[PDB]
Amino acid sequence: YVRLDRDRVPTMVGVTRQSRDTITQPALSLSTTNTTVGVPLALDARAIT
Amino acid sequence: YSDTYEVLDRFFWTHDSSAGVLVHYDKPTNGNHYILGTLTQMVSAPPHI
């Protein structure tokens, strides 16, 4: 959790399950072989208040 | 605050270091210690926060 910084907010989060072409290193395949996870969820601000 | 930096470094294994800690190492105020700043902002400097 970050409070107000623009440059600290997470934009995506992804998992990998395979490499890419010929590269063996997961640190080199992870940037282009990911799968973005995450769903949003609605609440009720009147109930919260 | 504590007495030994080894005990301080063992304490900061399970503690987070998100904003980063600061040491003093010269002549601290009330004993050997680390300082962890929080995520508040300074606003009295116009073009950037």
Side-chain angles (χ1 to χ4, degrees):
Chain A
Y1 292 154
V2 296
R3 182 175 180 267
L4 289 176
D5 293 330
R6 295 182 66 189
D7 293 331
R8 298 289 303 272
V9 174
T11 61
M12 58 86 61
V13 56
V15 298
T16 191
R17 63 185 183 179
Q18 57 184 354
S19 179
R20 192 268 309 274
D21 184 73
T22 309
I23 57 171
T24 301
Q25 292 84 16
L28 295 174
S29 66
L30 182 59
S31 179
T32 61
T33 318
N34 55 8
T35 299
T36 301
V37 299
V39 295
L41 182 60
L43 293 175
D44 193 1
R46 284 89 171 92
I48 298 297
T49 301
Chain B
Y1 294 23
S2 175
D3 55 353
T4 55
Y5 297 100
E6 290 86 3
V7 170
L8 285 170
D9 290 330
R10 187 174 294 275
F11 178 74
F12 275 98
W13 286 350
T14 66
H15 197 282
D16 58 349
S17 65
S18 66
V21 303
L22 298 173
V23 307
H24 205 192
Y25 283 172
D26 193 5
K27 184 184 283 184
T29 300
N30 292 315
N32 293 318
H33 70 281
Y34 293 176
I35 293 168
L36 188 144
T38 184
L39 279 74
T40 61
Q41 302 294 320
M42 184 186 74
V43 77
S44 65
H48 54 276
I49 301 300

Short mmCIF file of all heavy atoms in Angstrom, two decimals, chain B:
data_model
loop_
_atom_site.label_atom_id
_atom_site.label_comp_id
_atom_site.label_asym_id
_atom_site.label_seq_id
_atom_site.Cartn_x
_atom_site.Cartn_y
_atom_site.Cartn_z
N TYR B 1 14.91 2.22 18.87
CA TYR B 1 16.16 2.27 19.62
C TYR B 1 16.49 0.90 20.20
O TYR B 1 15.60 0.11 20.52
CB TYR B 1 16.17 3.28 20.78
CG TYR B 1 16.08 4.77 20.46
CD1 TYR B 1 15.53 5.24 19.28
CD2 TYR B 1 16.70 5.69 21.29
CE1 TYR B 1 15.50 6.56 18.98
CE2 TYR B 1 16.68 7.03 20.98
CZ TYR B 1 16.08 7.47 19.83
OH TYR B 1 16.05 8.79 19.51
N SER B 2 17.78 0.65 20.35
CA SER B 2 18.31 -0.55 20.98
C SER B 2 19.73 -0.25 21.44
O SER B 2 20.14 0.91 21.52
CB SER B 2 18.27 -1.75 20.03
OG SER B 2 18.89 -2.87 20.63
N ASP B 3 20.49 -1.30 21.75
CA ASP B 3 21.88 -1.14 22.15
C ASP B 3 22.87 -1.63 21.10
O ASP B 3 23.97 -1.08 20.99
CB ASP B 3 22.14 -1.86 23.48
CG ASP B 3 21.75 -3.32 23.45
OD1 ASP B 3 21.15 -3.77 22.45
OD2 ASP B 3 22.04 -4.03 24.44
N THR B 4 22.52 -2.67 20.33
CA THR B 4 23.44 -3.24 19.36
C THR B 4 22.81 -3.33 17.97
O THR B 4 21.64 -3.74 17.82
CB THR B 4 23.93 -4.63 19.79
OG1 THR B 4 22.81 -5.47 20.03
CG2 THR B 4 24.80 -4.55 21.04
N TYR B 5 23.61 -2.98 16.97
CA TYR B 5 23.15 -2.95 15.59
C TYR B 5 22.87 -4.34 15.04
O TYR B 5 22.09 -4.47 14.10
CB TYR B 5 24.18 -2.25 14.71
CG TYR B 5 24.39 -0.80 15.07
CD1 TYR B 5 25.48 -0.41 15.83
CD2 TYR B 5 23.50 0.18 14.66
CE1 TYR B 5 25.69 0.91 16.16
CE2 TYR B 5 23.69 1.51 14.99
CZ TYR B 5 24.79 1.86 15.74
OH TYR B 5 24.98 3.18 16.07
N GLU B 6 23.47 -5.39 15.62
CA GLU B 6 23.13 -6.75 15.21
C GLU B 6 21.71 -7.10 15.62
O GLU B 6 20.98 -7.74 14.86
CB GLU B 6 24.13 -7.74 15.81
CG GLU B 6 25.53 -7.67 15.21
CD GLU B 6 26.41 -6.64 15.89
OE1 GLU B 6 25.96 -6.02 16.88
OE2 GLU B 6 27.56 -6.45 15.45
N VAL B 7 21.30 -6.68 16.82
CA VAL B 7 19.92 -6.90 17.25
C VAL B 7 18.96 -6.04 16.44
O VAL B 7 17.86 -6.49 16.08
CB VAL B 7 19.81 -6.65 18.77
CG1 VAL B 7 18.37 -6.63 19.24
CG2 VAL B 7 20.54 -7.75 19.51
N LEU B 8 19.39 -4.82 16.07
CA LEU B 8 18.56 -4.01 15.18
C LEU B 8 18.39 -4.64 13.80
O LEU B 8 17.29 -4.66 13.23
CB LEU B 8 19.15 -2.60 15.06
CG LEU B 8 18.94 -1.72 16.28
CD1 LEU B 8 19.75 -0.45 16.16
CD2 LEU B 8 17.46 -1.39 16.39
N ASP B 9 19.47 -5.22 13.26
CA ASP B 9 19.39 -5.84 11.94
C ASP B 9 18.61 -7.15 11.99
O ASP B 9 17.97 -7.52 11.00
CB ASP B 9 20.79 -6.07 11.39
CG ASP B 9 21.48 -4.78 11.01
OD1 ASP B 9 20.77 -3.82 10.63
OD2 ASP B 9 22.72 -4.72 11.09
N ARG B 10 18.64 -7.86 13.12
CA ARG B 10 17.79 -9.03 13.26
C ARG B 10 16.33 -8.63 13.41
O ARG B 10 15.44 -9.36 12.95
CB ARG B 10 18.25 -9.87 14.45
CG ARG B 10 17.54 -11.21 14.58
CD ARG B 10 18.15 -12.04 15.70
NE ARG B 10 19.52 -12.43 15.39
CZ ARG B 10 19.85 -13.49 14.67
NH1 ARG B 10 18.91 -14.29 14.19
NH2 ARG B 10 21.13 -13.76 14.43
N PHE B 11 16.06 -7.48 14.02
CA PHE B 11 14.69 -7.00 14.13
C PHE B 11 14.13 -6.59 12.77
O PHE B 11 12.95 -6.82 12.49
CB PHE B 11 14.59 -5.84 15.10
CG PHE B 11 13.21 -5.27 15.23
CD1 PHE B 11 12.23 -5.95 15.93
CD2 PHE B 11 12.88 -4.06 14.63
CE1 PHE B 11 10.96 -5.44 16.04
CE2 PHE B 11 11.61 -3.55 14.74
CZ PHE B 11 10.65 -4.24 15.44
N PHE B 12 14.96 -5.99 11.93
CA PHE B 12 14.46 -5.59 10.61
C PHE B 12 14.44 -6.72 9.58
O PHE B 12 14.33 -6.42 8.39
CB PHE B 12 15.26 -4.42 10.06
CG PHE B 12 14.77 -3.09 10.53
CD1 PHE B 12 15.39 -2.45 11.59
CD2 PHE B 12 13.69 -2.50 9.92
CE1 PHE B 12 14.92 -1.22 12.01
CE2 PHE B 12 13.23 -1.29 10.34
CZ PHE B 12 13.85 -0.64 11.38
N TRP B 13 14.54 -7.98 9.99
CA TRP B 13 14.24 -9.07 9.07
C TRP B 13 12.74 -9.20 8.86
O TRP B 13 12.27 -9.24 7.71
CB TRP B 13 14.83 -10.38 9.58
CG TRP B 13 16.30 -10.46 9.43
CD1 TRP B 13 17.10 -9.61 8.74
CD2 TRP B 13 17.15 -11.47 9.99
NE1 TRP B 13 18.41 -10.02 8.83
CE2 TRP B 13 18.46 -11.16 9.59
CE3 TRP B 13 16.93 -12.59 10.78
CZ2 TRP B 13 19.56 -11.94 9.96
CZ3 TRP B 13 18.01 -13.37 11.15
CH2 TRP B 13 19.31 -13.03 10.74
N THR B 14 11.98 -9.28 9.94
CA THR B 14 10.53 -9.44 9.87
C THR B 14 9.80 -8.12 9.71
O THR B 14 8.63 -8.12 9.33
CB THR B 14 10.02 -10.15 11.12
OG1 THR B 14 10.24 -9.30 12.26
CG2 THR B 14 10.78 -11.44 11.33
N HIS B 15 10.46 -7.00 9.99
CA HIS B 15 9.89 -5.68 9.83
C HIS B 15 10.09 -5.23 8.39
O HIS B 15 11.08 -5.60 7.75
CB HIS B 15 10.56 -4.70 10.78
CG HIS B 15 9.79 -3.44 11.00
ND1 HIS B 15 9.79 -2.40 10.09
CD2 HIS B 15 9.06 -3.02 12.06
CE1 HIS B 15 9.05 -1.41 10.56
NE2 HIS B 15 8.60 -1.76 11.76
N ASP B 16 9.15 -4.44 7.88
CA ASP B 16 9.31 -3.98 6.51
C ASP B 16 10.32 -2.84 6.44
O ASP B 16 10.65 -2.20 7.44
CB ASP B 16 7.98 -3.54 5.90
CG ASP B 16 7.29 -2.43 6.69
OD1 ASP B 16 7.72 -2.12 7.82
OD2 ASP B 16 6.32 -1.86 6.17
N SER B 17 10.82 -2.60 5.23
CA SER B 17 11.75 -1.52 4.94
C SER B 17 11.32 -0.80 3.67
O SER B 17 12.10 -0.59 2.75
CB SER B 17 13.18 -2.04 4.82
OG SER B 17 13.30 -2.91 3.71
N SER B 18 10.03 -0.45 3.62
CA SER B 18 9.44 0.10 2.40
C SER B 18 9.99 1.48 2.09
O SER B 18 10.54 1.71 1.00
CB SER B 18 7.92 0.15 2.55
OG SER B 18 7.54 1.07 3.55
N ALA B 19 9.87 2.41 3.02
CA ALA B 19 10.40 3.75 2.80
C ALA B 19 11.90 3.84 3.03
O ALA B 19 12.50 4.86 2.68
CB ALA B 19 9.68 4.75 3.71
N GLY B 20 12.51 2.81 3.58
CA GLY B 20 13.94 2.87 3.83
C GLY B 20 14.26 3.47 5.19
O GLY B 20 13.63 4.41 5.66
N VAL B 21 15.27 2.89 5.83
CA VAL B 21 15.67 3.31 7.16
C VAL B 21 16.90 4.20 7.04
O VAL B 21 17.55 4.28 6.00
CB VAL B 21 15.95 2.11 8.07
CG1 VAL B 21 14.73 1.22 8.16
CG2 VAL B 21 17.13 1.34 7.55
N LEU B 22 17.22 4.88 8.14
CA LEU B 22 18.34 5.81 8.19
C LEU B 22 19.08 5.60 9.50
O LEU B 22 18.46 5.43 10.55
CB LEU B 22 17.84 7.26 8.10
CG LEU B 22 17.10 7.70 6.84
CD1 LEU B 22 16.55 9.10 6.99
CD2 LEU B 22 18.00 7.61 5.62
N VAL B 23 20.41 5.62 9.43
CA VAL B 23 21.25 5.44 10.62
C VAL B 23 21.89 6.78 10.91
O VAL B 23 21.62 7.77 10.21
CB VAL B 23 22.30 4.34 10.42
CG1 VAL B 23 21.64 3.08 9.96
CG2 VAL B 23 23.35 4.76 9.42
N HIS B 24 22.68 6.88 11.97
CA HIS B 24 23.36 8.14 12.23
C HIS B 24 24.86 7.96 12.42
O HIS B 24 25.64 8.78 11.92
CB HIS B 24 22.73 8.80 13.45
CG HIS B 24 22.90 10.29 13.49
ND1 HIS B 24 22.62 11.03 14.62
CD2 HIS B 24 23.29 11.17 12.54
CE1 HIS B 24 22.85 12.31 14.35
NE2 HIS B 24 23.26 12.41 13.10
N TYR B 25 25.28 6.95 13.19
CA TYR B 25 26.64 6.43 13.30
C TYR B 25 27.69 7.36 13.90
O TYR B 25 28.81 6.91 14.16
CB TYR B 25 27.19 5.98 11.93
CG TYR B 25 26.68 4.66 11.41
CD1 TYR B 25 26.99 4.25 10.12
CD2 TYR B 25 25.95 3.80 12.21
CE1 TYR B 25 26.55 3.05 9.62
CE2 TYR B 25 25.51 2.58 11.72
CZ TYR B 25 25.81 2.22 10.43
OH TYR B 25 25.37 1.01 9.94
N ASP B 26 27.38 8.63 14.15
CA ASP B 26 28.39 9.55 14.67
C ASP B 26 28.27 9.72 16.18
O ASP B 26 29.17 9.33 16.94
CB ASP B 26 28.27 10.92 13.99
CG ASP B 26 29.48 11.81 14.25
OD1 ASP B 26 30.47 11.37 14.87
OD2 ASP B 26 29.43 12.99 13.83
N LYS B 27 27.17 10.29 16.62
CA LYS B 27 26.86 10.53 18.01
C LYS B 27 25.35 10.70 18.06
O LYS B 27 24.85 11.82 17.91
CB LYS B 27 27.58 11.76 18.56
CG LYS B 27 27.36 12.00 20.04
CD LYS B 27 28.02 13.28 20.51
CE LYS B 27 29.52 13.11 20.67
NZ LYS B 27 30.15 14.34 21.23
N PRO B 28 24.60 9.62 18.23
CA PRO B 28 23.14 9.70 18.15
C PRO B 28 22.56 10.41 19.36
O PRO B 28 23.25 10.73 20.33
CB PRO B 28 22.72 8.23 18.09
CG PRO B 28 23.81 7.51 18.79
CD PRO B 28 25.07 8.24 18.47
N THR B 29 21.25 10.66 19.27
CA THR B 29 20.59 11.51 20.26
C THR B 29 20.51 10.84 21.62
O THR B 29 20.91 11.42 22.63
CB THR B 29 19.20 11.90 19.76
OG1 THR B 29 19.32 12.61 18.52
CG2 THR B 29 18.50 12.78 20.77
N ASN B 30 20.02 9.60 21.67
CA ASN B 30 19.83 8.94 22.95
C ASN B 30 20.26 7.47 22.89
O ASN B 30 19.69 6.63 23.59
CB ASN B 30 18.38 9.03 23.40
CG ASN B 30 17.97 10.44 23.77
OD1 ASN B 30 18.70 11.15 24.46
ND2 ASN B 30 16.81 10.86 23.29
N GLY B 31 21.25 7.15 22.08
CA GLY B 31 21.73 5.79 21.93
C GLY B 31 21.62 5.31 20.49
O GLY B 31 20.98 5.92 19.64
N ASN B 32 22.28 4.17 20.25
CA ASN B 32 22.40 3.61 18.91
C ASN B 32 21.04 3.17 18.37
O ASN B 32 20.35 2.37 19.01
CB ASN B 32 23.36 2.42 18.93
CG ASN B 32 24.79 2.83 19.25
OD1 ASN B 32 25.29 3.83 18.74
ND2 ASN B 32 25.45 2.05 20.09
N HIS B 33 20.66 3.68 17.20
CA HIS B 33 19.30 3.47 16.73
C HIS B 33 19.20 3.64 15.22
O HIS B 33 20.09 4.20 14.58
CB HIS B 33 18.33 4.44 17.40
CG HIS B 33 18.50 5.86 16.96
ND1 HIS B 33 19.50 6.67 17.45
CD2 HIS B 33 17.80 6.62 16.09
CE1 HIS B 33 19.41 7.86 16.90
NE2 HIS B 33 18.38 7.86 16.07
N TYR B 34 18.10 3.15 14.67
CA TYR B 34 17.71 3.39 13.30
C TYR B 34 16.49 4.31 13.29
O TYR B 34 15.77 4.42 14.28
CB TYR B 34 17.36 2.10 12.55
CG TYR B 34 18.50 1.13 12.30
CD1 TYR B 34 18.25 -0.11 11.71
CD2 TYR B 34 19.81 1.45 12.59
CE1 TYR B 34 19.27 -1.00 11.45
CE2 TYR B 34 20.84 0.57 12.35
CZ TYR B 34 20.57 -0.65 11.78
OH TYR B 34 21.59 -1.52 11.53
N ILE B 35 16.26 4.97 12.15
CA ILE B 35 15.09 5.82 11.97
C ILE B 35 14.39 5.40 10.69
O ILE B 35 14.98 5.47 9.61
CB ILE B 35 15.45 7.32 11.92
CG1 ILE B 35 15.97 7.80 13.27
CG2 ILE B 35 14.25 8.14 11.50
CD1 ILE B 35 16.60 9.17 13.23
N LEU B 36 13.13 4.98 10.81
CA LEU B 36 12.29 4.62 9.68
C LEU B 36 11.25 5.71 9.48
O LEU B 36 10.42 5.93 10.35
CB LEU B 36 11.62 3.26 9.90
CG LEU B 36 10.85 2.59 8.76
CD1 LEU B 36 11.05 1.10 8.82
CD2 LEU B 36 9.36 2.88 8.81
N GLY B 37 11.31 6.38 8.33
CA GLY B 37 10.31 7.38 8.02
C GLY B 37 9.04 6.77 7.45
O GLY B 37 9.06 5.70 6.85
N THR B 38 7.93 7.46 7.66
CA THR B 38 6.65 6.99 7.15
C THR B 38 6.42 7.57 5.75
O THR B 38 7.32 8.13 5.13
CB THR B 38 5.52 7.33 8.12
OG1 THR B 38 4.29 6.78 7.63
CG2 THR B 38 5.37 8.83 8.27
N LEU B 39 5.20 7.43 5.24
CA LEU B 39 4.88 7.75 3.85
C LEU B 39 4.19 9.11 3.70
O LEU B 39 3.55 9.35 2.68
CB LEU B 39 4.02 6.66 3.24
CG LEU B 39 4.65 5.37 2.70
CD1 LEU B 39 5.12 4.42 3.80
CD2 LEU B 39 3.66 4.66 1.80
N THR B 40 4.32 9.99 4.69
CA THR B 40 3.75 11.32 4.56
C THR B 40 4.57 12.16 3.59
O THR B 40 5.71 11.83 3.26
CB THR B 40 3.67 12.03 5.91
OG1 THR B 40 4.99 12.18 6.44
CG2 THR B 40 2.82 11.24 6.88
N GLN B 41 3.99 13.26 3.13
CA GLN B 41 4.58 14.09 2.09
C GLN B 41 4.93 15.46 2.64
O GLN B 41 4.37 15.92 3.63
CB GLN B 41 3.62 14.23 0.91
CG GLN B 41 3.20 12.92 0.28
CD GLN B 41 4.35 12.20 -0.39
OE1 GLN B 41 5.20 12.82 -1.03
NE2 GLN B 41 4.39 10.88 -0.24
N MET B 42 5.87 16.12 1.97
CA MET B 42 6.15 17.53 2.19
C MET B 42 5.57 18.33 1.03
O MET B 42 5.82 18.00 -0.13
CB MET B 42 7.65 17.82 2.30
CG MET B 42 7.94 19.28 2.63
SD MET B 42 9.68 19.73 2.62
CE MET B 42 10.00 19.76 0.86
N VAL B 43 4.82 19.37 1.35
CA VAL B 43 4.11 20.13 0.33
C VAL B 43 4.64 21.56 0.21
O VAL B 43 4.39 22.21 -0.82
CB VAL B 43 2.59 20.12 0.61
CG1 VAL B 43 2.23 21.08 1.73
CG2 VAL B 43 1.77 20.35 -0.66
N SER B 44 5.41 22.06 1.17
CA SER B 44 5.92 23.42 1.12
C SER B 44 7.18 23.53 0.27
O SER B 44 8.21 24.05 0.71
CB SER B 44 6.18 23.94 2.54
OG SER B 44 7.22 23.20 3.16
N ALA B 45 7.10 23.04 -0.96
CA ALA B 45 8.08 23.16 -2.03
C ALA B 45 7.29 22.94 -3.31
O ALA B 45 6.85 21.81 -3.57
CB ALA B 45 9.20 22.13 -1.89
N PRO B 46 7.06 23.99 -4.10
CA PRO B 46 5.97 23.98 -5.09
C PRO B 46 6.11 22.96 -6.21
O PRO B 46 5.22 22.12 -6.34
CB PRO B 46 5.95 25.43 -5.61
CG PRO B 46 6.55 26.22 -4.50
CD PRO B 46 7.61 25.34 -3.91
N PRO B 47 7.19 22.95 -7.03
CA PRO B 47 7.09 22.25 -8.33
C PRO B 47 7.07 20.74 -8.23
O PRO B 47 6.77 20.07 -9.22
CB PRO B 47 8.34 22.71 -9.09
CG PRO B 47 8.92 23.80 -8.29
CD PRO B 47 8.58 23.44 -6.89
N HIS B 48 7.37 20.18 -7.06
CA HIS B 48 7.48 18.74 -6.89
C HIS B 48 7.28 18.40 -5.43
O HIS B 48 7.64 19.17 -4.54
CB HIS B 48 8.83 18.24 -7.38
CG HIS B 48 9.97 18.95 -6.74
ND1 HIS B 48 10.45 20.15 -7.21
CD2 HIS B 48 10.69 18.66 -5.64
CE1 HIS B 48 11.44 20.56 -6.44
NE2 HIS B 48 11.61 19.67 -5.48
N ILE B 49 6.69 17.23 -5.18
CA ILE B 49 6.35 16.78 -3.84
C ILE B 49 7.25 15.62 -3.46
O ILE B 49 7.34 14.63 -4.20
CB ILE B 49 4.87 16.37 -3.75
CG1 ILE B 49 3.97 17.55 -4.12
CG2 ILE B 49 4.54 15.86 -2.37
CD1 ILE B 49 4.14 18.75 -3.21
#
